[PDB]
Design a protein around this ligand. Structure first.
Ligand SMILES: O=P([O-])(OC[C@H]1O[C@@H](O)[C@H](O)[C@@H]1O)OP(=O)([O-])OC[C@H]1O[C@@H](n2cnc3c2nc[n+]2cc[nH]c32)[C@H](O)[C@@H]1O
Ligand SMILES: O=P([O-])(OC[C@H]1O[C@@H](O)[C@H](O)[C@@H]1O)OP(=O)([O-])OC[C@H]1O[C@@H](n2cnc3c2nc[n+]2cc[nH]c32)[C@H](O)[C@@H]1O
Ligand SMILES: *[C@@H]1O[C@H](CO)[C@@H](O[C@@H]2O[C@H](CO)[C@@H](O)[C@H](O)[C@H]2NC(C)=O)[C@H](O)[C@H]1NC(C)=O
Ligand SMILES: *[C@@H]1O[C@H](CO)[C@@H](O[C@@H]2O[C@H](CO)[C@@H](O)[C@H](O)[C@H]2NC(C)=O)[C@H](O)[C@H]1NC(C)=O
Ligand SMILES: NC(=O)c1cccnc1
Ligand SMILES: NC(=O)c1cccnc1
Lengths: 250, 250
């Protein structure tokens, strides 16, 4: 297996994060059973590391699902840490990592041993090793639910400094999120193409892969808009480059 | 009493946070027993809610204590959320909330019932109800250790928009941290007096209580400097006021 092995203390972390998140839920939906959610989740840990399907996580989603505020969804590519920091634990936005079922798995890895009941802490399969591995099937199931339950203005943070372009035509956003958005429930889709401070401008709005994305969204009937280096996010990036000209204040 | 009851799922939250923090420790000190740490913490918990002393947490500290990188300490008053965000989970600085023994308690509340052995989830005592309460004694013990183990350049974030002054002569910083700093291993102390965007300029460096702080630190023999609205932090505040003139980029 060419992927990271199971995360140490997976259970304590999972339950801990689930417990903390409940407070972020409104009383009406605050009644969640972290123990039951964990039990449903670990069903993938009793199966062959290459035989886990997205649907195996149906119960897990059923027990952890909650509503996502209108206009607060944030999709992304190649911008993991910036998305989490900008979202600020649901205070500004609610990316999947800030939704209960995504929150319990952010940064984690897991899989059972090939021929043993115990968890494999050495390594886990990648899509390359085999398509139906625990982690990929989880994020497929999770991104599908996240997308279906989003409404209002859809925000997407892309990395304009990524060498392969801002929009990967193959991946979760393209293959599992875009196809599951509820057109009738969506106002418009707004893209933020972020560039590293001084970093390279590989692609900006309307260039390369961005043209492909723009065309697909528009062909699907979505109202579209793209912003290069959306200011609120640029300011966050600048916190670590305060003396850089791109970050100088008037 | 007058304070909020003990946090729900305290144990799961405690253990999860402990488990996640371990990854943030140097391999040389990553050897931490979260369950044992919890038990040591419980020693102080399972007592009369008005009979807990800082020393009751000695075992808890001993089992969770680890080193703090030189020049990475960040003390503060009246800016809890700004400090946590700026520190960015030990990435920029290591405030007490980003040190193992502080991390497991950040935002939490706890106390055992006055007459029953179970935890009191209804309410907990304040300094007013009684001085020796679980939470206050905890932070006293923790702030002492955090101060004793800090070295190099000392950073302090104060709120210059606080009505009553930037430096509270009665607070944990003044009463439990300043007196425990080890001058021998400290190079200098640097203050950042932050003002709310457009917010009020109650006090800036060299004014009111700030004069009190400067004189006390200099009387103790420390090298001192103060900065109004330290840029990196101002940029972070600006993320939420991108259009405000104080935040306009060059
Ligand atoms: O590997 P990275 O350089 O990031 C940093 C990562 O380096 C890894 O060693 C370490 O685990 C860390 O998370 O780039 P990455 O984009 O591959 O980001 C993949 C990460 O983002 C998390 N994640 C949060 N939201 C989602 C998601 N995963 C899938 N989906 C599909 C729809 N939504 C999501 C997921 O838990 C995964 O870890
Ligand atoms: O009450 P707040 O509006 O905060 C917001 C929170 O007050 C909590 O009751 C409620 O749950 C609320 O979410 O403002 P606050 O400044 O009083 O900050 C007090 C908070 O800072 C945490 N904390 C992190 N570091 C320390 C510390 N507490 C003491 N010390 C002494 C030296 N170092 C520290 C501590 O855990 C406490 O929650
Ligand atoms: C946006 O993409 C760039 C380019 O892929 C990322 O920067 C690279 O990050 C890797 C790993 O941290 C480094 O090894 C490279 O040297 C970086 N390249 C450059 C040109 O800086 C950047 O981290 C991405 N931004 C976000 C928020 O994820
Ligand atoms: C710095 O101090 C100011 C003033 O005490 C804080 O602002 C107040 O915050 C409370 C609680 O959020 C509000 O109800 C008041 O309306 C605010 N007043 C003003 C004048 O802003 C501010 O939050 C503090 N800064 C930080 C980072 O904690
Ligand atoms: N934000 C995403 O769509 C995503 C997909 C795959 C891995 N990490 C993040
Ligand atoms: N950082 C501190 O000194 C402090 C003091 C009292 C309450 N919260 C934080």
């Amino acid at each position: 297996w060419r992927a990271e092995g199971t995360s140490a203390h997976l259970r304590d972390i999972f339950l801990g994060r689930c417990a903390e998140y409940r407070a972020l839920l409104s009383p009406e939906q605050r009644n969640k059973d972290c123990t039951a959610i964990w039990e449903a989740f670990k069903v993938a840990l009793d199966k062959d590391p290459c035989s886990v399907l997205p649907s195996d996580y149906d119960l897990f989603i059923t027990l952890s699902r909650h509503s996502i505020p209108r206009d607060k969804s944030l999709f992304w590519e190649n911008s993991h840490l910036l998305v989490n920091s900008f979202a600020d634990n649901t205070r500004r936005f609610m990316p999947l990592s800030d939704v209960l079922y995504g929150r319990v798995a952010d940064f984690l890895s897991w899989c059972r041993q090939k021929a043993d009941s115990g968890l494999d802490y050495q390594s886990c399969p990648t899509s390359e090793d085999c398509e139906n591995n625990p982690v990929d099937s989880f994020w497929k199931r999770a991104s599908i639910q996240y997308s279906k339950d989003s409404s209002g203005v859809i925000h997407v943070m892309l990395n304009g400094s990524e060498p392969t372009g801002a929009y990967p035509i193959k991946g979760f956003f393209a293959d599992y999120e875009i196809p599951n958005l509820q057109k009738e429930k969506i106002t418009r889709i707004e893209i933020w193409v972020m560039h590293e401070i001084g970093g390279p401008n590989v692609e900006s709005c309307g260039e390369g892969s961005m043209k492909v994305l723009e065309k697909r969204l528009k062909d699907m009937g979505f109202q579209y808009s793209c912003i290069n280096d959306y200011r609120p996010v640029k300011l966050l990036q600048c916190v670590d480059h305060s003396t850089h000209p791109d970050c100088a204040l008037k």
